[PDB]
Design a protein around this ligand. Structure first.
Ligand SMILES: Nc1nc2c(ncn2[C@@H]2O[C@H](COP(=O)(O)OP(=O)(O)O)[C@@H](O)[C@H]2O)c(=O)[nH]1
Ligand SMILES: [Mg+2]
Length: 426
């Protein structure tokens, strides 16, 4: 979906009345999701998640209205596309048996090859297994991709598919396969789909798969609900892999099947070559939809401002004479993740004037701030409150706990006192 990029760009720039830009942006986005099918119910949910946040949350001090709204559209689109932060690209355990399931034509055998390569390159010993008995040239197809992918192979063109699959499993485990992908039929002869289901369930029983992956094409927006229910009944789905995300695209049906089985989309099929297969990371995918350039610019543009806001309070809290070890600790943290301060977009009330009294207040090194932070972390809660209590014995104890000089804990201490003096005026 490419119109959505243009919408973000119109919204982010092409000004006019703010609220008219957001009603229009929500409108564009909604049209754009529907065009990618998705599911009206899933589209009216994402817009309500966005409204609720827009009503309860307000841009943090300094952040523009628009920057904050895209940050809300992104985060909630991420949730819509699963994206609960769960990539899980490596299997969690030693031998990992993957049963592919799906209807013929969707890209199952291609996905088997693409999937074998992917794990080979990540340094896994991969075997493929041809269980498909009904499609002619299945054995040979998988054969090609297995050597093409640099993965071991085992198949039989004829027999009980369950026993072919059990045999291919044993063969490849014997030859030290750490991952085994079991390719399957997507049609039982003419098109008796209910013999196909009983075949998957039987293969599954003999094989004991660690992950049943449903392989689906990005061309069943509305029909993705049913397909998933049928396959989920026979072999409970644990993965979804979405094929044919090239040329004329779709995909919104993916996250309908995602919903029905409660299964994650682990891999996207984006072409015809072995190589054309990358994991599905929602954070990154929606970022591409929204416009990867803008979106990452906008999230930093916000995080800078939230940093400067901490420095704002830290400088302000000094200038109102409220300086403490907790103020300085928050001040250093803020200064550290920021850099050598600003000049282009300094834009700070406190920090401007703070440096305009003592230049050497906002001119500490990285290391000098990092040592001072370690120091504060080693002071007692009573010391944090009353640093004047810190005699020679304490000064010493502090130096040990934080790997520093008894004179270092003096430098901070003076800094504290020296800052505190100035803001008393004359
Ligand atoms: N464009 C594109 N084509 C694909 C993709 N995955 C599979 N195909 C094609 O889908 C067709 C059916 O492939 P196959 O793997 O035989 O499907 P199966 O019956 O489920 O095994 C072939 O023409 C493949 O080249 C993909 O990610 N993108
Ligand atoms: Mg096939």
């Amino acid at each position: 979906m490419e119109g959505v990029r243009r919408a973000v760009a119109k919204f982010l720039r092409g000004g006019g009345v703010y609220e008219k830009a957001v009603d229009a942006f929500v409108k564009d986005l909604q049209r754009e999701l529907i065009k990618a099918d998705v599911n009206v119910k899933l589209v009216l949910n994402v817009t309500r998640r966005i409204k609720e946040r827009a009503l309860k949350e307000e841009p943090p001090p300094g952040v523009t209205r628009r920057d904050w709204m895209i940050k809300i559209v992104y985060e909630e689109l991420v949730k819509l596309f699963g994206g609960d932060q769960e990539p899980q690209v490596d299997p969690p355990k030693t031998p990992w048996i993957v049963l592919l399931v799906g209807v013929q034509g969707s890209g199952k055998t291609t996905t088997a090859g693409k999937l074998a390569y992917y794990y080979v390159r990540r340094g896994y010993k991969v075997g493929l297994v041809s269980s498909d008995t009904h499609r002619p040239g299945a054995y040979e197809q998988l054969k090609r991709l297995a050597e093409e992918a640099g993965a071991m192979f085992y198949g039989e063109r004829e027999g009980d598919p369950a026993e072919i699959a059990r045999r291919g499993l044993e063969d490849l485990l014997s030859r030290g396969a750490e991952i085994v992908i079991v390719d399957t039929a997507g049609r039982h002869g003419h098109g008796e789909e209910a013999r196909l289901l009983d075949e998957m369930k039987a293969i599954a029983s003999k094989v004991r798969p660690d992950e049943v992956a449903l392989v689906i094409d990005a061309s069943i927006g509305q029909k993705a609900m049913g397909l998933a229910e049928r396959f989920h009944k026979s072999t409970p789905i644990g993965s979804i892999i979405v094929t044919k995300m090239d040329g004329t695209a779709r995909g919104g049906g993916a996250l309908t099947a995602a919903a029905v089985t409660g299964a994650r989309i682990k891999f996207i099929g984006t072409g015809e070559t072995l190589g054309e297969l990358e994991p599905f990371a929602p954070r990154r995918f929606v970022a591409r939809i929204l416009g990867m350039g803008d979106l990452e610019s906008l999230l930093e543009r916000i995080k800078s401002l939230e940093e400067a806001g901490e420095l704002d309070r830290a400088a302000e809290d000094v200038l109102k004479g409220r300086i403490t070890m907790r103020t300085i600790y928050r001040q250093l943290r803020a200064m550290r993740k920021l850099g050598p301060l600003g000049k282009v977009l300094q834009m700070l009330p406190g920090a401007s004037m703070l440096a305009s009294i003592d230049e050497g207040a906002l001119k500490l090194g990285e290391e000098k701030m990092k040592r001072w932070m370690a120091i504060i972390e080693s002071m007692t809660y009573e010391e944090l409150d009353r640093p004047e209590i810190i005699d020679k014995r304490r000064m010493r104890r502090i130096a040990i706990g934080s790997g520093t000089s008894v004179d270092d804990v003096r430098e901070l201490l003076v800094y504290y006192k020296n800052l505190k003096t100035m803001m008393k005026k004359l």
